[PDB]
Structures are given as structure tokens and as C-alpha cells.
């Protein structure tokens, strides 16, 4: 078990309802809990299946060197990258150059 | 797409609600107090929710709790079970008829009781004994264990009183036992079996709950009740609630309940229902 | 004993002076005669107090949470059955082959309007029932003047809606009697097999014909209209009060004395 | 050290710039890191002082029954509450619910 | 609300960047590649950022890095420090003059050098030896340690040289330590050019401090990698050092080590800064 | 080679092309820079420096300093802390010895007063005269350029002195402070080790700036304040750049610093 945080943006009420079933909603669209890897993977399936044209990011604590992992979904999502074992993030410009 | 209940072992064992009303506001299971404050409760991550006197429940709350496999338990004096709601019965008839066959046949039933006896006392029961005889022996062992815990914790003992009409220690035991009964009923229901069909206890709506819970109650739950009664503190029930929650989590009771139910029934040596 | 079942909707449920009271959206209060009712079916919009739940448990009245007009059963009081004596009675019948056959033949005897000849095998009874079920639908189609191609189109949609309401109230009745919806005889292997068993016996009396009546008018929203029609049927035509006696009569076929 | 997550909304560019100094911006307005209680407390100090209009939530992993803690800042912030040692959340009735009560 | 650099202890020790242009785009420190892809790097949570050849730097990048107390280190082939940028110098004159007073007085200098000797070898140096004598004694032990390690890990050894595989691993490993050490000295507010054992060089004090803990952590790892003889030695060396720095809490130890070394002059050190601590985060509410 | 020249670089990309240090623009036009001839290169916002350009600067011993527009402030420095230990210890020794420190302090006041001032006065007496001299010089410049003057703003709480002239003076002085610090850094000295002004991170910068402050920089502030501008900070920074371009102000900074420290009569390193 490790800390799990899910942040949604412009997702249908369906997904928000499902997340509120298992995770604590500390703010509209922000869900947090302490769950196992198996449950986390279930949560991601709920996200991948119910989100549509909406933006989601899910982050959880790991014993890795960076200390956390994350994955994104939907419109204009950012890309998780690895730099020499360190977890960073890459993304495209907003019309720049 | 479909909504599936998560395993009980992956949930908070119990939550006690004392006042207010539970409902579903804007797609969220909430608790609403008299002042209008909404408190979000992730219903799907709780094994069972306990409702104390003065608590109101809406149709939407009862519905959602059943859909997520969260047993709602109405609680009275000292945490005693007044009522419960959830998904009706066991969806699989094979599991029901399996449990029923084991309980109706006296030979199969006898094969289940000794298994219960062996798992509870950590040793085989004396051979060639009837269910009634085993019941008397079990009762004798129980009184002895009660007296031993009393001397060990320095609590004065005058016997076990199941009815509150007859002290401090007996209140702690009932409150602690009710916690175990709550999560046990939830486990039995989640496994697809009937809490009404027992082997040692019979005829009562929660006979199988009493059978399963009594096997492991002295291991962890009951002795902690004696420890609380030793301090003799204010709000003895509430302190027992927290202590049982810690016990359930550290011992992983909800995880162990499933194999316990299965092993107990397997003792009849009838081929169990095929998974899933 | 008591076999009546009632619907409660849109109100607060509490206990005053020891009385079971429903308080509507408006201030109008209604006193419910618990203790003389076998089951209370709670519809969306109802809010039950702790005291009301407690009182229902004392008098032995089962609380069942259902959708509008009993479209579905979401939750039940005393889940996993309250009465073990009744549950084990039903189980015993299904276990012994000789006993369950007596229940099956009794069911076919009730589907028919008469006792079936002893030489008839179970497989033949299904063939006979299947033919007169098919003939019943066709007769109902001719009566109400609807296009029928078999049991989709508007008519099948109305039938599904009508039976689903009956399936709900039937399940709640089975639960109120302390039996298991999953333990069926004619129909087996499904969570609501016993529900199908009992409902199939009485569905062609008022419920299914009502579906043909509504389907004839060709409504834009058939589901809502059918549910309301079934709601009135359950309200006036005492079909609810005949569910439990039917269930008991069916299981009475086994020569074993009832609990 | 434990995982820290900061989510901002309608927050001035000053705070977002500061948060991007120490934490990883996995999404615009969402910052994640693995920092100590000391660093956590100073980041919260930045939040309380740099955002006055916007809405912020900070959550971090802990060795508790619930397994995490959180705090909020800004308009319509929800309050972290304790029920028998469990961490839940409380909030006012929302006006834009589109559903009466 | 002022922007204050966090302790090096609470940071990633080092990050190597080999291509693109570091910049600050939309208020975020990023690495931009030739296609325009930006990679966010929380600069304030990094102690050293190493810049390999082919990497371009923008004004905003250098500015922000200095503001958050993150040393930028230009690195050549392979691992060798070419340049570095950061805050112009020590903000406190009393610290600079304290370090200079110790380095300018030959008596005070010798006392400092002896402490460095004792910390490096776990025992006090022979009595009444000059600095140049301690240097000879030090050099004798270092050659022995190099030889001792080369036999334990089973690596061919012809001595240490600063210009085959083992010597490249050692220099690459030591360069990681030097970068991190230079950052610690700057963060402490001292001058990396004012040394005690090493003198006259732009990084004399960096060599002084690093050589003390060099053989305990960094150097023996360079031998462990050299014997395996990997495809990319210097890259595997860098990752190894980062693991050791984290495991041994190197960053956290450096500043107290620096102070302890300077304190050996028996001159009263300048007073620590007045700590203005951020208040604790509001507690949860009961009866919720 | 002992160089004293300093230059600015702005709004361009910097790289080594064919062994040459060049500044390329947005159009692709490239200007050549005599890096081996300058002591310090001041990088203004908008500059981008390649790895090769940084390497070449280090080789020829030309210090790279990152500054704001027109040197309004110093954000970062190449070789932070100092690369030249011989200069630092030279500055440190002068500050550590009370006798040497006094000789430097008095020399600074001589350069401020513009006279040898052979009369033996205490440091406190020297500060008093300077305080009066500065106040008079401020008023004299206002009298010269016909500017309404109510005194220099030394307190941010003093709102009344928050006029146009004080804003122009602050902007001009900021530019002088930046190029002064860069000159100190290029000479291998520490900005925090001051003599007249002490206890501040830029104490030595203040000492050097206070000597040449009223020569060209501050008068320019009054000149711009004469014709009330909409954006004073902008026009002041531009005018200061023109002073740093036209006049030999930047070239005189390093020798001034050396001359000041040479008053300790301790032989400078070589």
C-alpha cells in the first residue's frame, strides 16, 4: 500500500462518482487514498474507461529513488520520462517557436 | 464500466456514525449533520458502516452501499446489532445448497464442528463425541479461558453476562465481540454464504456468524477487551472500537476470514463450488 | 399469518409515540400499520430513521429497498436471510430429488389450470408449457391488436418492463417469506431463478396483458408508462397479498410439514 | 521524506513559478515531489502567502491509519477532519450543485 | 515573500545534461531539445546540474539557478570541470575573513591541516611536522591505499595519473565529488579558492575537503566498476556516485565537515544565522 | 595580460565559430568579439551561450557575468566565490590588519574629496565631512539641472521623497552598482569585503561606486529627471548604457579598485 493521488479535469460526472466511491475528495476533482497496487491498477482502468476528452493525472508513492510514479491521460497530457533513473516530465510548447 | 466491490481486506474495517443523516449528494456518499456540514465518506473503501441511534439513512445511500458491497449495520446499546442491510442473499445457489447440505446432514455437520473445534483450540477434539457433547466441552473450555484472562489482567470475574441487565468487563466484551460479529457477517456475505445457516449455533439469523467469529475471538478481540476494562476509563465502548479496528488491521482479520469460512466448510469433504 | 406488502415513497420515516409514521414532501403525515404487514418496499426518495428501522425489526417486518414500482431490488434488510428455518426448508426440497420434482410438478400444475397426468415427464411438461405460453402471447396479441412476431420491437419492450416490476415485488416477497431467490426448481442456475419460478405463474393474469394494452397505443416512452400501470395494478388488484401464499403453496408440494 | 502533492487552481503566476522550483509539474497546476516535513512546511508557507485568490490543496504521505494528511487554502476550501483517528473531509453545501436539498 | 534556497541535504545530488538548451519557459526551468520538447527540472531541488558539451545555456536559466542556490557545472570529456556559475560569492564578509585569517597565518594553517589529516586517516599526524611534511606523509598513505584497493578488486595498477580504464573511472568519480563539494562550500559561504593543503588554485579548498572523505565513499567504487570494464564507464560511475552520496548522506555531512575543519584553528567562528522558521501546517479538525 | 576592459552582450546567441567567439543575431548576422582583450563580459537578458563559448572564455581568463539590462544587477558569476586566490588573500590581508585597513579607508575618502587631505582626522570626522559633501553634491546637481530637490530618499517609509528624481537616481545607481560588482569580480576580489562600508553582501561595491558616483552617472539622472518621462527607469538605463559605451567608465573601474587597495602599501600579486 502507498499514497495515491488522482486529479481530474473536465471529465464526465461518471468518473467523478466512481472515484468518490473509493478515494477521498479533498477538492472537486482531486482524490486521494492509501491503496495497494492492485486497487491502483483498478482505479486506472476506471479512468481509462470513463474519462473521455478529459484530462487526468494519477500519482503514487514508490520506493524508487525519485519516490513517486505518475501517468497521464486525455487532452494535452504531459509525458513521464526517465533521466538516468530519475522520473521527470516532458511536454510540448503552446505555440512557441 | 461495471461497478465491482473491492475485497474487504483492502478497506477500513469499520466506521461508527453517531449522529446526522447519510445520503448521496452530487454523486458522493456523505454524512450530513444537523448544521448542514457534509462529510465525504468513500463508502467503497469501508467494510461495514455502523449506524448509532439518531442516525437517518436515505434510499440513495442504502442503494450505493449495497452496490459497492459495504454492509450497513444499525447499532444499539453497547454496539449491539439491531439490523443490517445489503445485497439480498447469495447470488449463487450452488454455495447456498453446499452450505445447507453440510448443515442438514448430521454426519457432515459433525465433520464441520470438530474442524471448528480444532481451529479454535489448536488441538483435535476428543474422538467419538456428538455435536451436543462437543458443545458442552467447548463451553467448559470457554469459561476457563475467561477466568484465566481475568486473573491475567487483574479484572474481577463473576462470570460472563450476555445481557446488559446483569458490569464494566462484560460491557467491554460485548462491545468488542459485536465489532467482530459485524465484520464477520460482512465477510460471510461477501463470500456468498448464508449467515443464518450454522453448525454449532443453529436456528438464529446469525448462527454462522457466531460459529466463525467464536473461533478467533479469544485470539485477539476478547483479551483486548480485558485490557480496556483494566484501565476502567471514560467512554469504554469507544476505546474498544478503536482497539478492535487496530487488531483487525494488524492481524488482517478480513483477509483471514475468507479461508476460515472455506476451510470450515471443506471439512465435510464434499466438493466445494467451483471458482469464480 | 400476515402476507400483505406495501410501497412507501417520497418521505421521512420515523416513530412517534410508538407509531410508524411517514411524512410526505408536504406536511401530510401517514400512519403505517406495521406488525400487520409482511414487508415494506422502500422506493427512491424515502429516508428512514434509526427508530423506524428498529421498530420494523421488532415486529418482524422486512425492509426492502427497491426502485420505482419495484423495478429492481437494490438492498434488503437482514441480508443472507433472517429466518433459517424457512431457508433450510427450501434447501431441503431442492436437495432431495424426489422432493424437488413434487415442487416442479406442482408449479406446472399451477401454470396449467389443472393437475397434469402422472405419466408426463418433466421434459414433456416444459414442452407443453412452452407451447401454451407461446399461444398465450399470440392470443393476447390478437386481443389487443398488436403486431406479434414472438417474444426488439415496442411490444417486447413493454413486456420486459412489466415483468421487471413483477420480478422486483416477487423477490421482495420471497425474501419476506424467508426464502432464497437463487434456489429455483423449474428455472435454475441464476441469482433470481426462484423469482422467475413464482412470477411466471401469475404474470399472464394482469401484468403481461397490461403490457399489450399499452403497446397497442404505441407510446414514445413505454417504460415509464408501463411501470406506472404496474404500480396501479399492485395498488388495487391485491396481487401483492397473493405472492406469499402462492410461494408457500408451491413449496408445500413437498410432503414435508412447513416450519 | 514522503510524497508531496500540491494542486493549484486560479493561482497567480508567482506561486506556480515557486512551486515549479522545488516540485515536478506533472500537469499544469499539479506538482509532485518527495520532500521532508521541513520542506513541506516551507512550501505551505509559500502557498498561504503567494496565493490569495486561488484554491490550493496539499497532500502528503504519513504513517497514520489513513496513510495520508492534507490541508487546503482559498475560496470554498474543504476542511480536513478527524473521525475516530480516520482522516476524512468536510465541506459546506455548494450553491452550484444544480440539485436542491 | 523572499525566495530562499533549500539545504543541499534536501536535494538530488546531481543531474547530467548532454544536449539541448536549458531555459526558463513560462516560469519553469526546463531542458529544451532541438524539436522544442521541454523537460521540467525542479532546479531548486538539485544540488549540481552538470552541462556536457553540446549544451547551450540561456540567461534566464543561469539567473534562476543562482537564485535558488543550484550550482551549474560545465563538464568536458569526461566528467572534468570546465566552468561553473552561481552566486558571485560569499554574502558574509565575516565568514570569508575567518577562512582567510586561518589560511594566512602559518600557525593557524598548520592546525587546520592537522585536523584534515586526522579526519582523513582516523588518527592524529606525527607531532611537530610542517605542512610540507604532512603532505609527504599523506602522499605515502594515498599511494598505499590505491595499491591496496587495486589488489582487493583485482585491477592492474601502475599508479595514479591525471591526464587507462581505472584512472578514467577514478577521475570521473572524483569529479562528481568535486562538483558536489564545491556546491557545499559555496552554500556555506566560504571561498573555494582559499585552501590549506592545496593552495593557489581556483578550487584548492574543494580538493582539501573532498580528499578527506574521498576514499571512504567515492574511490573504492571506481575500482569496482573498472574491473567489470563496462561499455560506458563514466556514465555508470556517475550513477554509482549518486547512489553513494544518497546512501552515505554526503551532502548533509559536507558543511558540518567544513566548519569542523576550520574550527581547528581554535579561533572563535562567526555566529550562525538567525533562524526564521516557517510555522507548522494547520492541524485537522476534530468531531468531523 | 592584466586587462581592464569590460563589455556588454545582449539579445543574441553566443557560440564559437571557426575558433572565433561570435555573437549571432536573429537574422543570422554575426559580430566578432575580442574576448582575449577584455577582462569581463557582461551577459544581459536574452543571451544564450553555447558550451564551446563558455569553454573558450575560461581558457583566455575572461570572466563571464550574468547581469540585468544595462547592468542593473548581478544575478550570477562564472567561477563563483572567486577563481583568483592571490587577489582574494591580498584583499583579505588588507582588511584583516587594522593599520592596512585604515590606509585604504583614508585613501577612499581622499578620492571622494578629490584632495590628498593631509590633515590627520579621525574616521568619524571623515564620515561627517563626506555626509555633508554628498548632501551638497546632490543639491548642486539639482541647482545645475534645475530640478526640484527635497533630499535623497534613504528610507522606503519616507513616501514624500518618492519623487521622479529619486527614482532616476536609484535606477542610475543600480546600473553603476552592477558594473562595479562585475569589475570587482573580474579583478578577483570579493564584493562583501568592504572598508568604509561594512556588513553588507555588496559593501566593497558601494565603496568603489561611491567614489565615481557623482562623476557622470548621477548627473545623468538629474538630466533625465529634468524632462519628466513616462517611464523613468527605462530611459535612465539606456542613458547609463550610453555612458558605459561612449565614456571610458568601464575601463577605469579595475584600475580604480587596484589603486584603492594599493594604498595599503603591501605589494600586489603578480
Swiss-Prot record, chain A:
Knockout-associated phenotype: Loss of plasmid silencing.
Effect on the protein of changing residue 9 to A/R: No effect on spacer acquisition, Cas1-Cas2 complex formation or CRISPR DNA-binding by complex
Coiled coil: none
Outcome after substituting residue 77 to E: No change in spacer acquisition in vivo
E.C. designation(s): 3.1.-.-
Outcome, altering residue 84 to A: No effect on spacer acquisition
GO biological process, one term: CRISPR-cas system
Uppermost EC category: hydrolase
Family, similarity comment: Belongs to the CRISPR-associated endoribonuclease Cas2 protein family. E.coli-subtype subfamily.
Subunit details: Homodimer. Part of the Cas1-Cas2 complex. Forms a hexamer with 2 Cas1 dimers sandwiching a Cas2 dimer. The DNA lies across a flat surface extending from 1 Cas1 dimer, across the Cas2 dimer and contacting the other Cas1 dimer. Only 1 Cas1 protein from each dimer is catalytic, the other interacts with the Cas2 dimer and possibly target DNA.
NCBIfam families: cas_CT1978
Protein name: CRISPR-associated endoribonuclease Cas2
Swiss-Prot record, chain D:
Effect of residue 77 to E: No change in spacer acquisition in vivo
Effect listed in the UniProt record for changing residue 9 to A/R: No effect on spacer acquisition, Cas1-Cas2 complex formation or CRISPR DNA-binding by complex
CDD domains: Cas2_I-E
Any one Pfam family match given in the protein's UniProt record, by short name: Cas_Cas2CT1978
Mutant phenotype after disruption: Loss of plasmid silencing.
Family stated for the protein in its record: Belongs to the CRISPR-associated endoribonuclease Cas2 protein family. E.coli-subtype subfamily.
Entry protein name: CRISPR-associated endoribonuclease Cas2
Organism per entry: Escherichia coli (strain K12)
Organism lineage string: Bacteria, Pseudomonadati, Pseudomonadota, Gammaproteobacteria, Enterobacterales
From Swiss-Prot, chain E:
CDD domains assigned to the protein according to its UniProt record, in alphabetical order: Cas1_I-E (cd09719)
Result of altering residue 81 to A: Decreased spacer acquisition in vivo
Effect of residue 138 to A: No cleavage of any substrates, no restoration of UV or mitomycin C (MMC) resistance. Loss of spacer acquisition in vivo
Consequence the record notes for mutating residue 235 to D: Decreased spacer acquisition
Cofactor requirements of the protein: Mg(2+)
EC numbers: 3.1.-.-
Compartments, record wording: Cytoplasm
Gene inactivation effect: Not essential. Increased sensitivity to MMC and UV light; double ygbT-ruvA, ruvB or ruvC disruptions have no further phenotype suggesting Cas1 functions in the same DNA repair pathway. Function in DNA repair also seems to require CRISPRs. Cells elongate after 2 hours growth in MMC; they are even longer in double ygbT-ruvA, ruvB or ruvC disruptions, suggesting Cas1 may also function in chromosome segregation. Loss of plasmid silencing.
Induction / repression: Repressed by H-NS. Activated by LeuO. Activated by the BaeSR two-component regulatory system, possibly due to envelope stress. Part of the casABCDE-ygbT-ygbF operon.
UniProt: Mg(2+) binding residues: 138, 198, 211
GO MF assignments: 5'-flap endonuclease activity; crossover junction DNA endonuclease activity; DNA binding; endonuclease activity; identical protein binding; metal ion binding; protein homodimerization activity
Region ranges (Disordered): 268-288
Family: Belongs to the CRISPR-associated endonuclease Cas1 family.
UniProt domain comment: Substrate DNA-binding induces large structural changes that generate a surface for DNA-binding across the Cas2 dimer and formation of an optimal catalytic site.
Name this protein carries in UniProt: CRISPR-associated endonuclease Cas1
Effect on the protein of changing residue 56 to A: Loss of spacer acquisition in vivo, decreased protospacer binding
Gene: ygbT
Gene3D superfamilies: CRISPR-associated endonuclease Cas1, C-terminal domain, CRISPR-associated endonuclease Cas1, N-terminal domain
Any one cellular-component term (Gene Ontology): cytoplasm
Keywords (A to Z) from UniProt: Antiviral defense, Cytoplasm, DNA damage, DNA repair, DNA-binding, Endonuclease, Hydrolase, Magnesium, Metal-binding, Nuclease
Domain of life: Bacteria
Outcome after substituting residue 174 to A: No cleavage of any substrates
Amino acid at each position: 500500500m502507498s499514497m495515491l493521488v488522482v486529479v481530474t479535469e473536465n471529465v464526465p460526472p461518471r468518473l467523478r462518482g466512481r472515484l468518490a466511491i473509493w478515494l477521498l475528495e479533498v477538492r472537486a476533482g482531486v482524490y486521494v487514498g492509501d491503496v495497494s497496487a492492485k486497487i491502483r491498477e483498478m482505479i486506472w482502468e476506471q479512468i481509462a474507461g470513463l474519462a473521455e476528452e478529459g484530462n487526468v493525472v494519477m500519482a503514487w508513492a514508490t520506493n524508487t529513488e525519485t519516490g513517486f510514479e505518475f501517468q497521464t491521460f486525455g487532452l494535452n497530457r504531459r509525458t513521464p520520462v526517465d533521466l538516468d533513473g530519475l522520473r521527470l516530465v516532458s511536454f510540448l510548447p503552446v505555440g512557441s517557436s | 464500466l461495471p461497478l465491482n466491490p473491492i475485497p474487504l481486506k483492502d478497506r477500513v474495517s469499520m466506521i461508527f456514525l453517531q449522529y446526522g443523516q447519510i445520503d448521496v449528494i452530487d454523486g458522493a456518499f456523505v454524512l450530513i449533520d444537523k448544521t448542514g456540514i457534509r462529510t465525504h465518506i468513500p463508502v467503497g473503501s469501508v467494510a461495514c458502516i455502523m449506524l448509532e441511534p439518531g442516525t437517518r439513512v436515505s434510499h440513495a445511500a442504502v442503494r450505493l452501499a449495497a452496490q459497492v458491497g459495504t454492509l450497513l449495520v444499525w447499532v444499539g446499546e453497547a454496539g449491539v446489532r439491531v439490523y443490517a442491510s445489503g445485497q439480498p442473499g447469495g447470488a449463487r445457489s450452488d454455495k447456498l445448497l453446499y452450505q445447507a447440505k453440510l448443515a442438514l446432514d448430521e454426519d457432515l455437520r459433525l465433520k464441520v464442528v470438530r474442524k471448528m473445534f480444532e481451529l479454535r483450540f489448536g488441538e483435535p477434539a476428543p474422538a467419538r463425541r456428538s455435536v451436543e457433547q462437543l458443545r458442552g466441552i467447548e463451553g467448559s473450555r470457554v469459561r476457563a479461558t475467561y477466568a484465566l484472562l481475568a486473573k491475567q489482567y487483574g479484572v474481577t470475574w463473576n462470570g460472563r453476562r450476555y445481557d446488559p441487565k446483569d458490569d464494566t468487563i462484560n460491557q467491554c466484551i460485548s462491545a468488542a465481540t459485536s465489532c467482530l460479529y459485524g465484520v464477520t457477517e460482512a465477510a460471510i456475505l461477501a463470500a456468498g454464504y448464508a449467515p443464518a445457516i450454522g453448525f454449532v449455533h443453529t436456528g438464529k439469523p446469525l448462527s454462522f456468524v457466531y460459529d466463525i467469529a467464536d473461533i478467533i475471538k479469544f485470539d485477539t478481540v476478547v483479551p483486548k477487551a480485558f485490557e480496556i476494562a483494566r484501565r476502567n476509563p471514560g467512554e469504554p465502548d469507544r476505546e474498544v472500537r478503536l482497539a478492535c479496528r487496530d487488531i483487525f488491521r494488524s492481524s488482517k482479520t478480513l483477509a483471514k476470514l475468507i479461508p476460515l469460512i472455506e476451510d470450515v466448510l471443506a471439512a465435510g469433504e464434499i466438493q466445494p463450488p467451483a471458482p469464480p
